[PDB]
């Protein structure tokens, strides 16, 4: 997956020429070109130049051209991390994420993600899922591999998982639970809904839509109770979830709408009733291993179209750079 | 006649310091979250916004977590969700973010409005970007989020006057003269105006 | 005198002596003082009950119609008085001020019931 882009549209391979012109402009407070950060990025060949690029990405984010951090520039940088390590500094840049502001919502997430599994990279690979969950993604077939890893770590970590990591499972469970293809997507949706509707009566609602892209509607357990009716018209932690709620600050809710602690006999029966029909109508980690084989038809044909887009882009970009210097 | 050289020259010097070292958005828009004061102004905040400013985040510290700064995303004020069950939100067209702010925020953005199920083109500037009442509508269930389906008499002093007026005009004509309120529009007070019409202080 | 963004207002303006007020409705600016100059002088309002108990008001409505059509703002004590006149709708502050004393008397009647 590497030997395609490596015709990097050959340029200068220098750095002592470049790195002065990129902070003379900051000391004078000039706006900087959007291409010179990338030309710094496509000349890294040492681990100290990785940290040089990190300082300069930090200084490029705090700039008058705080926009124009283009996706192929990030793609060159993540190809630079794939060249050297792709073990810590890419993770640090994805986890800071505002000081640097990368955001590569592409197949670039999957290219960095699957290579973690090649060294199996558990604890360092878990965070990339946890930050792309906060992002909006998954208009791509990446839902299979994200769910693959997150159920690998479901069967690896087994606790209360934290105050908030129990919430940091659920959204990456739920938005890849848009799978109409199998009932395993509707199962991931259920396991998401269980442990995010579980924090609603534990701590409060605001923590769920604190930063992760959710919705402030307090009814989420019923949204699992209705997609299970969708299943029965077309899991076993919700059983402990609905009864664990039933066992022994700014209020947002209204005085006519009832608080959902008094409805736990209404949460027992509506859920314990329909599973008796799910019996009559109609493991997890092996299912996504079935899905890794059945799916992943490998759309690099769109990736190559983007490479063509960037070979269209940078040429007409540097044409105006040549004319801006002849205009003097 | 005496021409005022220093009194005219000083307006130029005050203009090139209202324009050059005027302080940017981070250095007059932050808030001490413990003491409820502000940097560079020091005047405390109203007590109808203490819980909402302690507890809920602002617009562009939330919306700096998206690629190309959330170029087509939907967002909605916090008390908009409390007062308006109908859809009222912002589509985005452009963000001009602050750069000097660590944990980058406090930009100026402008885009398309929707109010209570009614939207309109000609993307104007958005109000209350520094305010702590913001909540992001995610790209999941945005299609479920967007969902939506005379004549009053005159004052009695005019009622006696204009009847006598028509009786002088020639026809008594006891059809009741009515002023139209259908031509008068009834926007509420939460309705936002153009951010340009206010200036920064 | 250049007023930095001044507009018109129809206000009261005092001309009584001490402990005997005498208002005067006047079309003036927003920033010129209370007993100061104006644009047009209108029919005044005497707030004291006269012999055999009347409070006298004057309204030159043919010119009050002219000024707020020309773009005059109005004071809330003036809008109460036009509401009492019926040239305006009655003021909601006047209505709820009536209701506040009516609910105070609704309390007073229960108070008079409890002390017999």
């Amino acid at each position: 997956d590497s030997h395609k882009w490596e015709a990097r549209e050959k340029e200068h391979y220098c750095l002592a020429d470049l790195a002065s012109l990129m902070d003379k402009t900051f000391e004078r407070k000039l706006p900087v070109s959007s291409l010179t950060i990338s030309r710094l990025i496509d000349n890294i060949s040492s681990r100290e130049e990785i940290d040089h690029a990190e300082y300069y990405l930090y200084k490029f984010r705090h700039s008058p051209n705080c926009w124009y951090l283009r996706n192929w520039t990030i793609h060159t940088w993540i190809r630079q991390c794939l060249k050297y390590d792709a073990q810590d500094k890419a993770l640090y840049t994805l986890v800071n994420k505002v000081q640097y502001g990368i955001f590569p919502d592409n197949f670039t997430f999957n290219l960095l993600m699957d290579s973690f599994i090649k060294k199996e990279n558990y604890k360092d690979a878990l965070s990339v899922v946890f930050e792309v969950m906060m992002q909006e993604a998954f208009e791509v077939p990446s839902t299979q591999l994200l769910s693959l890893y997150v159920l690998f770590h479901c069967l690896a970590k087994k606790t209360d998982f934290s105050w908030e990591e129990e919430r940091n499972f659920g959204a990456s469970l739920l938005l890849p639970g848009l799978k109409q293809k199998n009932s395993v997507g509707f199962s991931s949706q259920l396991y998401g809904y269980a442990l995010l509707g579980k924090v609603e009566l534990q701590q409060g609602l605001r923590a769920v839509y604190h930063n992760m892209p959710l919705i402030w509607k307090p009814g989420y357990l019923d949204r699992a109770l209705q997609v299970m009716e969708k299943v029965a018209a077309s899991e076993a932690l919700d059983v402990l979830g609905a009864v664990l709620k039933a066992l022994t600050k700014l209020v947002e809710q209204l005085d006519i709408e009832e608080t959902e602690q008094s409805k736990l006999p209404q949460y027992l029966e509506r859920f314990k009733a329909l599973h008796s029909k799910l019996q009559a109508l109609g493991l997890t980690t092996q299912l996504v291993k079935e899905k890794l084989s059945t799916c992943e038809a490998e759309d690099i044909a769109t990736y190559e179209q983007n490479l063509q887009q960037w070979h269209l882009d940078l040429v007409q970009l540097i044409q105006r750079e040549q004319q801006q210097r002849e205009q003097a | 006649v005496r021409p005022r050289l220093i009194a005219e020259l000083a307006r130029r010097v005050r203009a090139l310091r209202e324009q050059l070292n005027r302080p940017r958005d981070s250095q007059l828009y932050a808030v001490d979250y413990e003491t409820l004061t502000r940097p560079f102004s020091g005047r405390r905040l109203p007590v109808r916004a203490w819980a909402d400013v302690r507890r809920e985040s602002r617009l562009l510290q939330l919306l700096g977590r998206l690629p190309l700064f959330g170029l087509g995303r939907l967002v909605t004020r916090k008390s908009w969700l409390w007062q308006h069950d109908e859809p009222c939100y912002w589509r985005l067209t452009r963000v001009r973010p602050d750069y000097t702010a660590q944990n980058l925020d406090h930009g100026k953005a402008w885009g398309i409005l929707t109010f209570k199920g009614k939207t309109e083109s000609e993307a104007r500037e958005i109000e209350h970007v520094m305010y702590h009442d913001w909540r992001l509508v995610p790209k999941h269930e945005e299609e479920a989020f967007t969902a939506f389906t005379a004549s009053v008499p005159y004052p009695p002093l005019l009622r006696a006057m204009i009847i006598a007026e028509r009786q002088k005009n020639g026809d008594t004509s006891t059809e009741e003269p009515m002023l139209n309120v259908q031509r008068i529009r009834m926007e509420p007070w939460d309705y936002p105006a153009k951010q340009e019409d206010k200036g920064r202080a | 005198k250049a007023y930095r963004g001044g507009h018109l207002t129809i206000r009261l303006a005092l001309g009584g002596c001490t402990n005997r007020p005498f208002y005067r409705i006047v079309a003036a600016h927003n920033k010129c003082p209370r007993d100061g100059r104006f644009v047009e002088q209108l029919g005044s309002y005497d707030p004291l009950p006269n012999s055999h108990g009347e409070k006298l008001v004057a309204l030159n409505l043919d010119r009050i119609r002219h000024w707020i059509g020309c773009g005059a703002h109005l004071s809330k004590p003036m809008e109460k008085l036009l509401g009492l006149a019926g040239f305006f709708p009655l003021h909601p502050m006047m209505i709820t001020n009536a209701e506040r004393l009516r609910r105070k008397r609704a309390r007073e009647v229960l108070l008079a019931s409890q002390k017999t």
Partner: peptide, 29 residues
């Protein structure tokens, strides 16, 4: 007013509230 509106204003102004009746009576002597 309907109580789905009265509850919203109560939710706005929870901690600072004065209890109240509805309409006043018809006549005051």
């Amino acid at each position: 007013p309907p109580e789905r509106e009265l509850s919203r204003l109560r939710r706005l102004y929870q901690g600072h509230l004065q209890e109240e009746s509805g309409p006043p009576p018809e006549s005051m002597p």
